[model samples]
Target chain A: GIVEQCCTSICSLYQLENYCN
Target chain B: FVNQHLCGSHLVEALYLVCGERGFFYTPKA
Candidate 1:
């Protein structure tokens, strides 16, 4: 999951991530 | 690498598309 989370959310929207996975 | 399908479709000069705005194709599977 090292990248699954970080890779999905753009850095700008990291805080507003919706966890699409 | 998010830096990687990932053709961005825009590169598809065949469609005259500059970038995927929202709706261009039905499938995200490039």
Candidate 2:
């Protein structure tokens, strides 16, 4: 759940490993 | 770190507006 939120917020803006992976 | 850096940049932009600096550029990622 934590990782999901982290990726959600981060991916909402810039591209990152969380989004890419 | 890169994410934090960008967030800092956004915060600085906000501060600039608070300081009466209009005409700043802000683009939504979407």
Q: Against the true two-chain complex, what DockQ does each candidate achieve?
A: 0.04, 0.06
Q: For model 2, what is the error of residue A14's alpha carbon versus the real structure, in angstroms, after optimal superposition?
A: 28
> Fraction of true inter-chain Cα contacts (below 8 Å) kept per model?
0.00, 0.02
Off by over 4 Å in 1: A10-21, B1-30
lDDT by residue for model 1 (B1-30), tens: 232212333223212232234322222232
Q: Which residue pairs does candidate 2 place in steric collision?
A: none
Provide the TM-score of chain B versus the true chain B for each model in turn.
Answer: 0.20, 0.37
lDDT of each: 0.27, 0.35
Give per-model TM-scores.
0.16, 0.26
Per-residue CA lDDT of model 2 for A1-21, tens digit only, reads 212433335422233322322
Model 2 chain B lDDT-worst window of ten: B21-30
Location of the lowest summed lDDT over 10 successive residues in candidate 1 chain B: B10-19
Cα lDDT for residue B2, model 2?
A: 32
* RMSD each, Å: 12.7, 10.8
Report the number of the highest-DockQ candidate. Answer: 2
Per-residue alpha-carbon lDDT of model 2 for B1-30, expressed as tens digits? 334333445533433443352333333353
